[PDB]
Nucleic acid binder design. Sequence first.
RNA 1: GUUACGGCGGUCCAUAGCGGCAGGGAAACGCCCGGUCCCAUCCCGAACCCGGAAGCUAAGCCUGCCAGCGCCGAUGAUACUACCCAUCCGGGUGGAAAAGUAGGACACCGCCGAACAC
RNA 2: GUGUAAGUGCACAAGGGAGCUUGACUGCGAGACGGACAUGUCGAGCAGGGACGAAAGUCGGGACUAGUGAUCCGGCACCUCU
Lengths: 79, 182, 126, 53, 136, 75
Amino acid sequence: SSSRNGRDSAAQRLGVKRFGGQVVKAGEILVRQRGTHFHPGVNVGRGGDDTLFALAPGAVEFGAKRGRKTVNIVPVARP
Amino acid sequence: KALPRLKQRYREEIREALQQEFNYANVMQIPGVVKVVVNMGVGDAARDAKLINGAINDLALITGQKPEVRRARKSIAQFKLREGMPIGARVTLRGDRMWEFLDRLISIALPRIRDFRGLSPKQFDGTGNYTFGLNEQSMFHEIDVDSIDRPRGMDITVVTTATNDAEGRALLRALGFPFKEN
Amino acid sequence: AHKPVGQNISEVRRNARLRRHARLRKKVAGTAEVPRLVVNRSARHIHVQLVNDLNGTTLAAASSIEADVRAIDGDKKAHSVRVGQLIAERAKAAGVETVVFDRGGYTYGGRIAALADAAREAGLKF
Amino acid sequence: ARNEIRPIVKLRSTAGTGYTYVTRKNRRNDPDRIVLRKYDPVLRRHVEFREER
Amino acid sequence: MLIPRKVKHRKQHHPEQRGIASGGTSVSFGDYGIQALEHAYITNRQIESARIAINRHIKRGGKVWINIFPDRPLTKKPAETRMGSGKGSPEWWVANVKPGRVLFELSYPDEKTARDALTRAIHKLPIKARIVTREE
Amino acid sequence: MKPGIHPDYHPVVFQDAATGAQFLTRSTATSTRTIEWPTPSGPKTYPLIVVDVTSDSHPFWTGSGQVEKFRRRYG
RNA sequence: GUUACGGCGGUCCAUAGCGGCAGGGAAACGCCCGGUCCCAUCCCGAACCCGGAAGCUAAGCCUGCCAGCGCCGAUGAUACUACCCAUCCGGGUGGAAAAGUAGGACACCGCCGAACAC
RNA sequence: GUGUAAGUGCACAAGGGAGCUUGACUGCGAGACGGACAUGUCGAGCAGGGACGAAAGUCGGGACUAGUGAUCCGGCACCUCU
């Protein structure tokens, strides 16, 4: 007379965190993710948990490189 | 500074005859045997892991090169078969060693099979690759035929750049395989 | 009405080369102050370039076709060596000291390696 | 967890003239215990340890 | 009886009864069809009753197509039990039926007998429905 | 092939013991598997192997009820 | 500058693919000859590597052709929907698919090198 | 197919295989995520001393997420602290 279900796992707060256009510093986290849904491009690095981060400051551009959505960083214009 | 029998013969007569038969534009289209293949499936890998070594030794004595031991990539337990159990040995032959092997096979052993009427013309496939099989190794004088503890047959297959069975059979005829001429 | 069956080894060798070259290329980069040294080999002769992959442009060049490089007599290796000399001179004229070395989808050793080692000897930083 | 004689067993990895116990948890149904091993100690440098429990 | 041989998930939500048909709004394989007008869940036993109603009204020869199959279950839970403590087991199987959708298609020559048969099969179902000819 | 040595490789003279239509050629058959009599058939000398049987001594494609008899036999 | 050339790259990567037809080999891309030397096969100079240019453009490759296997793809309408009106129903302002259709398309672009030339 | 559940990804391979091998290191850490709080997660880059590789460069465990338990009280080795 039991429901043997009921369990669940607390969240991990995944997804995009710095969308198109924004200004990001270095080492900042663009997206947390399990697999490489989004891949790195230029001035972008990968983590251990397939997190992404910035290697050079600038601003974002979610473009594709041969069918795969990438993330990039572009040079800000110095004031 | 040397030439095997079948290869000198190949470059002398057989290319000419196939040209005069099939009338190719380029001679690059001429059919030519590439390699020869040998295999032995032990099959009792799960019951005798030592017949494998026996077969290795036989094919060593037969072909003059240490074989390859083919592992079982899948595990099918209805045969005891598990991932990595050695089931068979395999050897590739290319070049002068190949032509010498065919010379020996055609000239010593296949004229030593019991009541050899003929190898079929129907062991081909798609274009002319002849895949026959031997029950015992009691035939090669290469082998020390006193020491054998069991029959360990084998399976041979001969691959050629021929494009169809007609060209394959014609080439192998010119090279002297005893087909059943039909 | 004769017709073939399948793959020739020329096609195999070609597409495997492209396969492993664009495998390797993941790690190699390009820049006008650190360009890529591409090599493109054949049996007879050889070609090389200095590439900027930021714009897919080219800064230097050389090959064993030019009569001045055919004026070598020695082995294929010696042709390659003099080629490395020429590209060192040209690169350091056009204003490049440091580079990487892309083996272009070929194995290191033989003509490739003797080229590159001659270049390392004659000044390029790699 | 506990201290049962688990498959993943043993510990301690001591150093020769290098007293900086580096630790690792490994099995023990396999044979070996008189070869390999290396690491950086104090005041010293990349040299060779034992797995000495 | 109509049931599937196996479903992956044998405890499903209740289907939706919102929206009009997308497919099955056109007679396909016969001449004289049935078309729904409302939203409803139609079960196994209803369709059995209806096909028998038709075959006992033509009685000899003339074909009947059933463009529906009960591939979505529902869950009763046993009697006199306080709410809570889980989700009941599947007991009967429905197909959702959105308006515009076609259920049955007959092929019998005379329209008299055919229209009458379809009417007898309409009065075995919970929905308002109407009868269709393949024509425009 | 390469070290991790294979069997040894030396020439061979397969002397036709059928009708004297012998063979002779390079092979991987030698210390491994050879016979005495280094007979030079050519400019060099190399082992020989008696050939008990071969092609030109093995009838085959390459080499070479009845009632009319019953009442022949039964008269 | 330029031709049926080769090589390195790019496109928010099939408008670029697969298959069929014809056609090309000057220098180059190739295939091929052979394992002396570096080097290599979980066995095999098959591959990788080395040394050369007898032979052939048959194949790879490049060129044109075929919209056929695949792809791309609108306008307008519909579904759905935000907001508002509305005693159930339904409706108005804006947004707007998928599929389908008309069609497109046997790719385009950049750099160096050759050959060719004033 | 990915050691083990599922998903997200992986053919550009993270799948399969072979040779060396211990970075399954020490001293740190910009800036960030998530955030009641304590916990938790990644982290480029610098230094010694190394592996591999021809070099560029990668290596501070495993394709990623689970695989464990705060504080107190005791135990073992080392310290130029008392």
